[PDB]
């Protein structure tokens, strides 16, 4: 026993506000304080701020007092965090995460449960479809043992897109380079490795499927 | 605030062995200093509190020690589960702070990049660009250096390119290199060359292609 539930992604604008929830179950909600973690990617933890929904206490951090609610639905279980004037700088995971059961002083806490994370991308840049590209090999690329075949996959918003080789076959030897966004625009590649015998002889086609957007490229190679 | 440094960005290990990651914070903290698990795919997992005091389903494998400034994680006998990101904080003062990370890769036999260049298609072109890329593909260690030389002249321009975790079936690295030109740049140069050092090679690979020889 003892999970805290999250409450699902969400893309919004600049400026903006969210507010996020952390269900809780397994213990009595009112007990143990909750906390707000952040994190940038690729950078460390971060501490928001702490509310318990039964002794009648909050901290933030001060850099976040600013920008931050906590606030509490004691019967429902629930924790939500509001984050305001949403900027550029505030895209990254949040978790919810129990404290334990003491208080909170020179420590007598540490966070023993954490919740499965929220993911927050704040972008001013609507929905552009992507630019599925073959990328096939350099002439005079004096003829392998095997063959690199890639998939340039420019521009794009938002993400989910899929690459699919084969319509499903070649699962293994590929490789799905992690998008990365130059100017709002996201950017992405695959690549696929198969022997001479296996092409220019036959047919390897790559399948990028950006679902909002109702796109679906396919491309031969 | 306290500040608290994670030495050790990345740590690269063997299975089996003893690893010792490593905190220290900038007040003394009075061994308020907790060890977090972050696995592959999100997850926080609390494994030591209060310096050294384990947690419930810690495996015994993990330990800590640490006083005042300095303190340290123990992971004895690497196993296969322990590839993760650990995180330290202090619980002394508010707020409570916490450590960049260190991240586990695990060693394997070196592996050499089998590289790839890429030339512009048509369909770009007709579009009004140029994105020469090249794969760096498969390679152990996560060291490596790319070079482009549009002729034979070296260009950090243009060259936005996509590193990689280590893979979890195989733990290589692979990396994209774009280089991304116009039609008219790409239109007035010939040979275009990807380049690669890597640990397990003192000859440069270079990768190749002209431009009009097609």
């Known amino acids: 026993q003892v999970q805290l539930q999250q409450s699902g992604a969400e893309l919004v604008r600049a400026g903006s506000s969210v507010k996020m929830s952390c269900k809780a179950s397994?213990?009595?909600?009112?007990?143990?304080?909750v906390n707000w973690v952040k994190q940038r990617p690729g950078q460390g933890l971060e501490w928001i701020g702490y509310?318990?929904?039964?002794?009648?206490?909050?901290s933030y951090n001060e850099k976040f007092k600013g920008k931050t609610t906590l606030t509490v639905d004691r019967s429902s279980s629930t924790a939500y965090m509001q984050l305001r004037s949403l900027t550029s700088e505030d895209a990254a995971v949040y978790f919810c995460?129990?404290?334990?059961?003491?208080?909170?002083?020179?420590?007598?806490?540490?966070?023993?449960?954490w919740g499965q994370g929220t993911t927050l991308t704040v972008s001013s840049a609507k929905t552009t479809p992507p630019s599925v590209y073959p990328l096939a090999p350099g002439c005079g690329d004096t003829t392998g043992s095997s063959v690199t075949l890639g998939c340039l996959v420019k521009g794009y918003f938002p993400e989910s897109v899929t690459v699919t080789w084969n319509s499903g076959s070649l699962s293994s030897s590929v490789h799905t380079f992690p998008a990365l966004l130059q100017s709002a625009l996201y950017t992405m590649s695959s690549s696929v490795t198969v022997p001479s015998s296996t092409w220019p002889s036959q047919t390897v086609t790559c399948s990028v499927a950006h679902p909002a957007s109702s796109t679906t490229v396919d491309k031969k190679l | 605030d306290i500040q608290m440094t994670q030495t050790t960005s990345s740590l690269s290990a063997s299975l089996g062995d003893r690893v010792t990651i490593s905190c220290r914070a900038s007040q003394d903290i009075s061994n308020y200093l907790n060890w977090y698990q972050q696995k592959p795919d999100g997850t926080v997992k609390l494994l030591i509190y209060?310096?050294?005091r384990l947690h419930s389903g810690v495996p015994s494998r993990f330990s800590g020690s640490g006083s005042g400034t300095d303190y340290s994680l123990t992971i004895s006998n690497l196993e296969h589960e322990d590839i993760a990101t650990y995180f330290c904080?202090?619980?002394?003062?508010?707020?409570?702070?916490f450590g960049g990370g260190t991240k586990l890769e695990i060693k394997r036999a070196d592996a050499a990049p089998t590289v790839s260049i890429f030339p512009p298609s048509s369909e770009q072109l007709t579009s009004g660009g140029a994105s020469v890329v090249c794969f760096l593909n498969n390679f152990y260690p996560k060291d490596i250096n790319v070079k482009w030389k549009i002729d034979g002249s070296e260009r950090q321009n243009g060259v936005l390119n996509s590193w990689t975790d280590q893979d979890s079936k195989d733990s290589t690295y692979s990396m994209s290199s774009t280089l991304t030109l116009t039609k008219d740049e790409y239109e007035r140069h010939n040979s275009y060359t990807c380049e690669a050092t890597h640990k397990t090679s003192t000859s440069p690979i270079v990768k190749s292609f002209n431009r009009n020889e097609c």
């Open positions: 209060y310096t050294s």
């Open positions: 397994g213990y009595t909600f009112t007990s143990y304080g």
């Open positions: 509310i318990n929904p039964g002794k009648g206490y909050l």
């Open positions: 904080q202090q619980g002394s003062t508010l707020p409570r702070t």
């Open positions: 995460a129990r404290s334990f059961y003491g208080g909170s002083d020179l420590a007598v806490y540490y966070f023993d449960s």
